[PDB]
Symmetry: D2
Subunit: 120 residues, 4 copies
């Protein structure tokens, strides 16, 4: 299932609990960027996915403020969980920083992360 | 600041409460798509933003399942709150549906919404 | 239709000619970023679009090198032309810079531009 | 170099010539979607990349009309070429379909493609 400890291709660690009714709650530790230690994450997932072999839609957010650092930014990941012998969460993400209105055009990075349960 | 009722350019409704710990909680009603009634949202925001004229970074997620409908999809909005009179939240979003592996290339829509506080 | 001079909400300038074969060619001048003067653009559009009220799909690219400056980056705009009086091109864009492998995660910005025909 | 025949992770074929002054010109055959045979592509790349080990920025567009089909849509790929023993083009893409104004919110798919010169 979705609940567990996941790692992306950068070595970031995503520890999450999937609640029965659709909540995602956990912590995220980024291997890159202006970040140290764990950050709070929350999100949602489809708690009754289709029964046709499709993945399970989900998303979550981290605001990059914790007890140690504040990067004045937030990332959201949107994607799907694909179960099986080697489960995956395939995502695309948007990282928005707080900017002035004049710099808003350069506020948001986009990328993609693949998560597996394999510890690097 | 963030706490309140917001609408976007499609006529969708966002009711949110921003907690002291950086939490966002509330409900979302979409004017479009495979959606009816309110859906749970959850997210996070920068609870100690810069005071140099920058927006406040925030994001949230809605999974499009409630007790009335399930679209097997989820949207995340990533953006920033711009306060003052005429408060706005400017976002870009990703909407992913659950797909088979063969259809995964067409799983995700992208767009942008502007929210106005009422 | 598409052929002409366009501006966006940032004050950038897009001069384009749409060819019978689906080609777009022209020049772009950005109001923002690491850019000065005109840059070559090239792209494609649907030269036989639907006539049922749909926009006309199109995209183009600018690499941010000209004979005056090089920002080691490139933007692509993907969107659709909506004709008539008050013609518009509504787009979303991806701006990728050349990076080292360690910095690749932060290579690409995303945004949206609306162009108005003059 | 960039000039050559590339394949993505779906098995699509990207045949391109990189002109000396920044042009990309070629053809694209998609393994998926409403597509058959080759489609014209054009784009641009940085014809004088940095000399610090960075990739080469580039982008290109395909409108999905050819002699056989018209899907009333266009894809742009934005990314970078990374040379070496196993050269790659790493991209993110936007696929916009012509829609009514009311359906514009659902006009654009986003994804990512990785290209290599290895024929599947
Ligand atoms: O670095 C972070 C937090 C960690 C992000 C980690 C990302 S989440 C998507 C991806 N997946 C993963 O596991 N890790 C990465 N936030 C960006 C904060 N922005 C700046 O510091 C900044 C930047 C910038 C932007 C992106 C990446 C690196 C640097 C550039 C210019 C200005 C700023 C800036 C300055 C003042 C206030 C706010 C932002
Ligand atoms: O419609 C929704 C839920 C509501 C989204 C509203 C969006 S959120 C971003 C934006 N902002 C806002 O306020 N409203 C919109 N989700 C997409 C569900 N997808 C499908 O049913 C689907 C579609 C499709 C695409 C767009 C709109 C409607 C339907 C196309 C092909 C296949 C599917 C599909 C089939 C089976 C299972 C899952 C998806
Ligand atoms: O500024 C440009 C060229 C002009 C883009 C204009 C954009 S196109 C989408 C939008 N629409 C429009 O009309 N104008 C804007 N390219 C980015 C170059 N990147 C860097 O120099 C860079 C940056 C950065 C990010 C945003 C703006 C300015 C600079 C941040 C970190 C590192 C780099 C960097 C360093 C070395 C080599 C390449 C990139
Ligand atoms: O399928 C294509 C062309 C081929 C795209 C291949 C993509 S390019 C990004 C990726 N990389 C790659 O190598 N292959 C894929 N265009 C989409 C045309 N849209 C529709 O037919 C359509 C769809 C839809 C959207 C995306 C994918 C599949 C289907 C859904 C609803 C309505 C339409 C539609 C109807 C009438 C007119 C236009 C669009």
């Amino acid at each position: 299932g979705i609940t567990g400890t996941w790692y992306n291709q950068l070595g970031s660690t995503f520890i999450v609990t999937a609640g029965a009714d659709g909540a995602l709650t956990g912590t995220y530790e980024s291997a890159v960027g202006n970040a140290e230690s764990r950050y709070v994450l929350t999100g949602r997932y489809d708690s009754a996915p289709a029964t046709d072999g499709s993945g399970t839609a989900l998303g979550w957010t981290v605001a990059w403020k914790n007890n140690y650092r504040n990067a004045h930014s937030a990332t959201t990941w949107s994607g799907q969980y694909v179960g099986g012998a080697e489960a995956r969460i395939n995502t695309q993400w948007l990282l928005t920083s707080g900017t002035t209105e004049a710099n808003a055009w350069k506020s948001t990075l986009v990328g993609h992360d693949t998560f597996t349960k394999v510890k690097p």
